[PDB]
Design a protein around this ligand. Structure first.
Ligand SMILES: CN1CCC(C#N)(NC(=O)[C@H](CC2CCCCC2)NC(=O)N2CCOCC2)CC1
Length: 217
């Protein structure tokens, strides 16, 4: 496997989004993963509608809109729905709204999704290198997470009790510290222009490899 990977260099990652006061991290994680696959398949980079997931992938998928959701069930909704609209056609409002999906605005489809084995960072590395960005959950509740600015994030108080859905778009090594390149959805003001490098191969730090999954088209 390559020593390092960064899907941004392959034009497979869209601009960092700002979820605001709506707990839609799961939706942004899911669309980010599908966006890479869409780019890989069609050659076109297109932001997908996180709002579409918030408003439509709901109760039936065990999701709660602005109150939380799952990337895997969001993927299944896209499969069941036979599509997901573009962000431009169905903009993000950081609120729970009535489902307004319209296939006339469909920008991607999903045929299946895969959940990686729990806590295996080597398997996660293989997937990020060979398949594309991977949706994951991390423990982002520690004060240090919000204040991250640079370097490689390592928090002794971190746990494998994850609460925040984000996207791994790469991995590598910085000054002797291996890391996972993570795309957050708290806008460009957070961390390194919206990204955070989180410790890799450090005992599944913050649960980053606890619940990984990626869709396919
Ligand atoms: C509790 N609050 C809700 C929104 C948030 C995001 N944004 N997190 C979530 O949506 C997380 C993401 C999930 C990804 C997969 C591994 C486990 C975590 N989910 C989540 O909080 N719920 C609670 C409601 O029932 C559905 C799941 C931040 C924390």
């Amino acid at each position: 496997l390559p020593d390092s990977v960064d899907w941004r260099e392959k034009g497979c990652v869209t601009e960092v989004k700002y979820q605001g006061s709506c707990g839609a991290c799961w939706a942004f994680s899911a669309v980010g993963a599908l966006e890479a696959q869409l780019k890989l398949k069609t050659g076109k980079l297109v932001s997908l509608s996180a709002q579409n997931l918030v408003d439509c992938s709901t109760e039936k998928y065990g999701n709660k809109g602005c109150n939380g959701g799952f990337m895997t069930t969001a993927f299944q909704y896209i499969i069941d729905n036979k599509g997901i609209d573009s962000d431009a056609s169905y903009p993000y409002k950081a609120m729970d709204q009535k489902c307004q999906y319209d296939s006339k605005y469909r920008a991607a489809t999903c045929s299946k999704y895969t959940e990686l084995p729990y806590g295996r960072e080597d398997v996660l590395k293989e997937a990020v290198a060979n398949k594309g960005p991977v949706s994951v959950g991390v423990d982002a509740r520690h004060p240090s997470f919000f204040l991250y600015r640079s370097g490689v994030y390592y928090e002794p108080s971190c746990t494998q009790n994850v609460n925040h859905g984000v996207l791994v778009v790469g991995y590598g090594d910085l000054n002797g510290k291996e890391y996972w390149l993570v795309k957050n959805s708290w806008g460009h003001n957070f961390g390194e222009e919206g990204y955070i490098r989180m410790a890799r191969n450090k005992g599944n730090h913050c649960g980053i490899a606890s619940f990984p999954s990626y869709p396919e088209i």
